C-alpha cells in the first residue's frame, strides 16, 4: 500500500539523518594526520588500529560524495569528501609508478605499497563520484589515471578481464595466495560498478565501451552458465579455480561451524548476486539501455536470491548456498542485507512480482529491528540467524559506511519510484 | 655445401652494400621539409605523390636503425634514422590526443588524422629499434606512449585482441569499411613483431607478458584451427568475418584475372605465414624460450608454405592459396619472397629437413635473377609467375625497404648460423 511505502521511507529518512550519518560526521575526520578514522568498537570508541586502508579512505570519499549529491548530511559532506581526496592524493598516490597504495598507517605513511585492483576499483568509483558531486576535477583526473593504468598493466589481452594484484612497480604478483594468477568476481563486479560512475562523469566513448565489455565478461564468464549465480574465482583462462585466501585481505574471515557442506565449492552469495543485478540495472540506466537487454541474467540473479536467500521466518538474507539452491550458511552479515534492500526493490520494478516487495519488507524489518545498533547508529557486522550479534565492532579497516548509506539512499529513492508508478 | 653457403652470403653482401642501401641513401632524405622521400618510378625518379605516410616514415626509421645496428650503411644510417624520428615526433605525433597520425603531405602537414593500429604497430617497432640502435631515449619514450594508448583505447577487454581503426580523438571508427568492427591477422601479427622489439628495448615485465599474450592470440584465434595457416579477418568475437577492403589502405589492390577461385574465402598467404613463423622464432629467442614451445604451429606454417607456395619450376613464392593446399594465385609479389628467404632458413634450422634449404635457394635465385632491378638496386613489386615485371614502380607510400633490407641482413646471418652448425 501507499501508506506502507510512506512508513518505510520515513523510517529510512529519520534513521539516515539522525542516526547513521551523525555517527560518522561526529567521529571520522582526522584533522591532525589527514584522512579518516574508521576503527570503532561496540561502544563507538576508537579501537586503536594503526591503519588507514585504501578501502576505508576511498569508500569514505564515495559515501560522502554520493550522500552530498543526494542532498543528505546538512551540506557538510562535500568538504568531508574533499578532505578524503586530499589524503588519497597526498598520502596514497604513488608519484613514481602511479596508482594508489594499498595501506597507510594512521600518520599517513605507506605500509603496504602493492597495487591491488580491488582497491583501485574503489578509487575509480569514489573519485568519479567525487567530481560528479563537487565539480573538483581532481576526482576525474585521478580516476582516469587509474583506469589507464589498469588497461596498461592489468588487462589480459588474450583471455580478457583483469589480473588483480601487483607489486608497487606494477610487476605481477606471484601465483596462489600472492594473487597474481586468479581472476575474481569481487574485482570484476566492482569494476562494473566503478566504470559506470566513471562513464557517468566523463561521457567518453572509451569508458562506455569498456563498461559494456565488463558487463559482458561478468555475464559470459563469471556467472554460472546454467544458474546465473556468481562464481568467485577463476584461472586466467576462465576455467573455475579452487577457492583460496589471498595474502592481501579486505574482510575478516568468518567460519560458521554449523554451516553445511563446508568443503563444497559450489557456493554463491545471495548478497553479491543481488548487488550485481541492481548495479547492472543502474549501469543500463546510465547507458540509456532497457533492463531487458539482460533480462535472462537479471531474472536468474534475483529469482535465486528470493527463492533461497530470504529468511521468511526470522528476517534477513543468509550468507551463502549452492548454485542449485541449497542454503549453506544462515548467519546474517551486514552488507548482504544492504544489497538485498536495493536489489529486491529493483527486482519488483523490473519483474513486477509481489514476492520481491514481500522480500524487501522482510529484509527492511530485519535491518531496523535487529541489525541496526540504534544507540550509536551503525550496523552490527555479523549476527546469528535469529538476529543476535556475533561480532560487535561497529567499523574497521574494511567496514565503513559504503554499503549501508548507499542502501538507505537508494532504497528511499526506489520506494518513491514504486509508489509513484 | 659450405662453398654454396659462402657464395650465397657473398651475393647478398655485395648487393646489400653496393646496390640496395645506396638506392635509398642517395635519394631519400628530405632536408627541406624533413622526413623521407619514397616515391620512385621504374627509372628511380620522383613520381611526385604529395604523401609522407606513417607507414613509409616509420618503416624507414626501422630499416635505417636496424641496418645500422647490424653494421651496414657505412655508419650513416643512424643519423638518417634520427632525421626520421624528428619527423615522426615533430610532424606526425598528436600533441592533443596522443598517437601518430596516419598521413602527412610532402610539406609535413597532417592530411589523414586517424589513429590506425597497423601504422601504430610500425611506430612501436621502428622506435624501439631506433633506441636499441642509437641510445636516443626518444624512441622508447614514444614507443611506450603508443603501447600505453593501444592498451587504453584499442584492447577489447572482453574478447581479447585489438580494435584497429580510430578517429583522431580515439573514438572507434564505424563498422565495415570504416574499420571499427574487425580484428585482423595484419594488425595482430605485426603487433607481435613490434612488441618483441619493444620488450628487447625495455626489458619490462608488462611488455614480456603482453608479447606472450599476443603470441597466444595469434596461435589460438588467428591461425586456422586445423591447418595452422593465417586467416585474415575476424569479427570482435573471433568468429571468421567476410573479407572486405577498408577505406584506409596500405597497399595497392591487385587482381590476377587468371587466379583460381576468386570468390573463395579460404585463402591464406604463404608469405604471411612464413613471416609469422620466423618472427615467432625471433620472439622466442628474445624471450629465452625454445622453438619447440610452439613446435606444432611453427611446423604447420612452414610445411604448408614449402609444400604449396614454392614454385620449383620457375622460382619464387606464389601469392596465395587455400588452407587445405590448392594454389590460387601464382603471381610473384616482392614482400613474400623476402619473408620466405628468412623463413625457409629458420625452417631448416629448427626442422632440419633439406627441402627447406632447397626452397631457400629457389627463392634466393628468383630474387637475384628475376626480381631485383640491378640497374637501380630495388625490387620489382609484382611479376608474372615466370618472372616478368607487371608493375614497375620501385617504391611508393607502402613499398619502401622494410621487407627487402631486413631479408638481406637476416638471411646472411641465418646462412652463417647454418654454415657454423
PDB file of N, CA and C in Angstrom, chain B residues 238-274:
ATOM      1  N   UNK B 238      35.822 -13.157 -32.592  1.00  0.00           N
ATOM      2  CA  UNK B 238      36.794 -14.085 -33.158  1.00  0.00           C
ATOM      3  C   UNK B 238      36.123 -15.172 -34.006  1.00  0.00           C
ATOM      4  N   UNK B 239      34.852 -15.007 -34.347  1.00  0.00           N
ATOM      5  CA  UNK B 239      34.334 -15.743 -35.494  1.00  0.00           C
ATOM      6  C   UNK B 239      34.885 -15.148 -36.783  1.00  0.00           C
ATOM      7  N   UNK B 240      35.027 -16.000 -37.800  1.00  0.00           N
ATOM      8  CA  UNK B 240      35.563 -15.544 -39.088  1.00  0.00           C
ATOM      9  C   UNK B 240      34.619 -14.586 -39.780  1.00  0.00           C
ATOM     10  N   UNK B 241      35.190 -13.472 -40.314  1.00  0.00           N
ATOM     11  CA  UNK B 241      34.388 -12.465 -40.989  1.00  0.00           C
ATOM     12  C   UNK B 241      34.581 -12.559 -42.499  1.00  0.00           C
ATOM     13  N   UNK B 242      33.591 -12.151 -43.306  1.00  0.00           N
ATOM     14  CA  UNK B 242      33.822 -11.970 -44.746  1.00  0.00           C
ATOM     15  C   UNK B 242      34.952 -10.978 -44.944  1.00  0.00           C
ATOM     16  N   UNK B 243      35.819 -11.240 -45.926  1.00  0.00           N
ATOM     17  CA  UNK B 243      36.942 -10.347 -46.176  1.00  0.00           C
ATOM     18  C   UNK B 243      36.456  -9.103 -46.909  1.00  0.00           C
ATOM     19  N   UNK B 244      36.815  -7.932 -46.389  1.00  0.00           N
ATOM     20  CA  UNK B 244      36.483  -6.671 -47.039  1.00  0.00           C
ATOM     21  C   UNK B 244      37.694  -5.761 -47.169  1.00  0.00           C
ATOM     22  N   UNK B 245      37.566  -4.796 -48.075  1.00  0.00           N
ATOM     23  CA  UNK B 245      38.537  -3.718 -48.194  1.00  0.00           C
ATOM     24  C   UNK B 245      38.158  -2.624 -47.210  1.00  0.00           C
ATOM     25  N   UNK B 246      39.153  -2.059 -46.545  1.00  0.00           N
ATOM     26  CA  UNK B 246      38.889  -0.918 -45.686  1.00  0.00           C
ATOM     27  C   UNK B 246      39.112   0.385 -46.453  1.00  0.00           C
ATOM     28  N   UNK B 247      38.456   1.459 -45.977  1.00  0.00           N
ATOM     29  CA  UNK B 247      38.716   2.801 -46.541  1.00  0.00           C
ATOM     30  C   UNK B 247      40.201   3.176 -46.440  1.00  0.00           C
ATOM     31  N   UNK B 248      40.796   2.884 -45.283  1.00  0.00           N
ATOM     32  CA  UNK B 248      42.215   3.127 -45.047  1.00  0.00           C
ATOM     33  C   UNK B 248      43.002   1.936 -45.593  1.00  0.00           C
ATOM     34  N   UNK B 249      43.894   2.205 -46.567  1.00  0.00           N
ATOM     35  CA  UNK B 249      44.683   1.163 -47.209  1.00  0.00           C
ATOM     36  C   UNK B 249      46.170   1.375 -46.942  1.00  0.00           C
ATOM     37  N   UNK B 250      46.922   0.317 -47.153  1.00  0.00           N
ATOM     38  CA  UNK B 250      48.377   0.429 -47.061  1.00  0.00           C
ATOM     39  C   UNK B 250      49.017  -0.484 -48.083  1.00  0.00           C
ATOM     40  N   UNK B 251      48.363  -0.623 -49.232  1.00  0.00           N
ATOM     41  CA  UNK B 251      48.923  -1.370 -50.347  1.00  0.00           C
ATOM     42  C   UNK B 251      48.080  -1.076 -51.565  1.00  0.00           C
ATOM     43  N   UNK B 252      48.625  -1.469 -52.723  1.00  0.00           N
ATOM     44  CA  UNK B 252      47.870  -1.366 -53.979  1.00  0.00           C
ATOM     45  C   UNK B 252      47.066  -2.652 -54.121  1.00  0.00           C
ATOM     46  N   UNK B 253      45.841  -2.557 -54.580  1.00  0.00           N
ATOM     47  CA  UNK B 253      44.976  -3.717 -54.717  1.00  0.00           C
ATOM     48  C   UNK B 253      45.244  -4.372 -56.067  1.00  0.00           C
ATOM     49  N   UNK B 254      45.665  -5.630 -56.068  1.00  0.00           N
ATOM     50  CA  UNK B 254      45.956  -6.340 -57.317  1.00  0.00           C
ATOM     51  C   UNK B 254      44.900  -7.413 -57.524  1.00  0.00           C
ATOM     52  N   UNK B 255      44.367  -7.492 -58.741  1.00  0.00           N
ATOM     53  CA  UNK B 255      43.541  -8.623 -59.122  1.00  0.00           C
ATOM     54  C   UNK B 255      44.278  -9.401 -60.198  1.00  0.00           C
ATOM     55  N   UNK B 256      44.466 -10.712 -59.977  1.00  0.00           N
ATOM     56  CA  UNK B 256      45.056 -11.553 -61.016  1.00  0.00           C
ATOM     57  C   UNK B 256      43.908 -12.235 -61.745  1.00  0.00           C
ATOM     58  N   UNK B 257      43.595 -11.824 -62.977  1.00  0.00           N
ATOM     59  CA  UNK B 257      42.401 -12.379 -63.651  1.00  0.00           C
ATOM     60  C   UNK B 257      42.491 -13.849 -63.912  1.00  0.00           C
ATOM     61  N   UNK B 258      43.700 -14.424 -63.960  1.00  0.00           N
ATOM     62  CA  UNK B 258      43.862 -15.857 -64.153  1.00  0.00           C
ATOM     63  C   UNK B 258      43.957 -16.627 -62.849  1.00  0.00           C
ATOM     64  N   UNK B 259      43.896 -15.938 -61.696  1.00  0.00           N
ATOM     65  CA  UNK B 259      43.851 -16.613 -60.406  1.00  0.00           C
ATOM     66  C   UNK B 259      42.628 -17.506 -60.281  1.00  0.00           C
ATOM     67  N   UNK B 260      42.780 -18.603 -59.527  1.00  0.00           N
ATOM     68  CA  UNK B 260      41.677 -19.544 -59.347  1.00  0.00           C
ATOM     69  C   UNK B 260      40.784 -19.139 -58.169  1.00  0.00           C
ATOM     70  N   UNK B 261      39.548 -19.637 -58.188  1.00  0.00           N
ATOM     71  CA  UNK B 261      38.602 -19.497 -57.072  1.00  0.00           C
ATOM     72  C   UNK B 261      38.574 -18.075 -56.493  1.00  0.00           C
ATOM     73  N   UNK B 262      38.384 -17.068 -57.357  1.00  0.00           N
ATOM     74  CA  UNK B 262      38.463 -15.678 -56.887  1.00  0.00           C
ATOM     75  C   UNK B 262      37.394 -15.334 -55.840  1.00  0.00           C
ATOM     76  N   UNK B 263      36.298 -16.076 -55.765  1.00  0.00           N
ATOM     77  CA  UNK B 263      35.329 -15.771 -54.704  1.00  0.00           C
ATOM     78  C   UNK B 263      35.522 -16.594 -53.430  1.00  0.00           C
ATOM     79  N   UNK B 264      36.443 -17.564 -53.412  1.00  0.00           N
ATOM     80  CA  UNK B 264      36.667 -18.347 -52.199  1.00  0.00           C
ATOM     81  C   UNK B 264      37.170 -17.443 -51.078  1.00  0.00           C
ATOM     82  N   UNK B 265      36.813 -17.780 -49.827  1.00  0.00           N
ATOM     83  CA  UNK B 265      37.347 -17.065 -48.670  1.00  0.00           C
ATOM     84  C   UNK B 265      38.265 -17.937 -47.824  1.00  0.00           C
ATOM     85  N   UNK B 266      38.699 -19.105 -48.335  1.00  0.00           N
ATOM     86  CA  UNK B 266      39.634 -19.945 -47.595  1.00  0.00           C
ATOM     87  C   UNK B 266      41.078 -19.693 -48.016  1.00  0.00           C
ATOM     88  N   UNK B 267      41.366 -18.478 -48.466  1.00  0.00           N
ATOM     89  CA  UNK B 267      42.681 -18.116 -48.996  1.00  0.00           C
ATOM     90  C   UNK B 267      43.614 -17.739 -47.850  1.00  0.00           C
ATOM     91  N   UNK B 268      44.881 -18.110 -47.996  1.00  0.00           N
ATOM     92  CA  UNK B 268      45.891 -17.797 -46.973  1.00  0.00           C
ATOM     93  C   UNK B 268      47.156 -17.436 -47.726  1.00  0.00           C
ATOM     94  N   UNK B 269      48.046 -16.682 -47.051  1.00  0.00           N
ATOM     95  CA  UNK B 269      49.265 -16.152 -47.695  1.00  0.00           C
ATOM     96  C   UNK B 269      50.503 -16.901 -47.224  1.00  0.00           C
ATOM     97  N   UNK B 270      51.191 -17.555 -48.160  1.00  0.00           N
ATOM     98  CA  UNK B 270      52.391 -18.301 -47.799  1.00  0.00           C
ATOM     99  C   UNK B 270      53.431 -17.352 -47.180  1.00  0.00           C
ATOM    100  N   UNK B 271      53.573 -16.174 -47.787  1.00  0.00           N
ATOM    101  CA  UNK B 271      54.498 -15.165 -47.260  1.00  0.00           C
ATOM    102  C   UNK B 271      54.157 -14.726 -45.850  1.00  0.00           C
ATOM    103  N   UNK B 272      52.899 -14.427 -45.587  1.00  0.00           N
ATOM    104  CA  UNK B 272      52.499 -14.031 -44.242  1.00  0.00           C
ATOM    105  C   UNK B 272      52.712 -15.148 -43.251  1.00  0.00           C
ATOM    106  N   UNK B 273      52.447 -16.398 -43.667  1.00  0.00           N
ATOM    107  CA  UNK B 273      52.593 -17.494 -42.728  1.00  0.00           C
ATOM    108  C   UNK B 273      54.056 -17.753 -42.398  1.00  0.00           C
ATOM    109  N   UNK B 274      54.946 -17.639 -43.414  1.00  0.00           N
ATOM    110  CA  UNK B 274      56.393 -17.747 -43.183  1.00  0.00           C
ATOM    111  C   UNK B 274      56.874 -16.608 -42.295  1.00  0.00           C
TER     112      UNK B 274
END
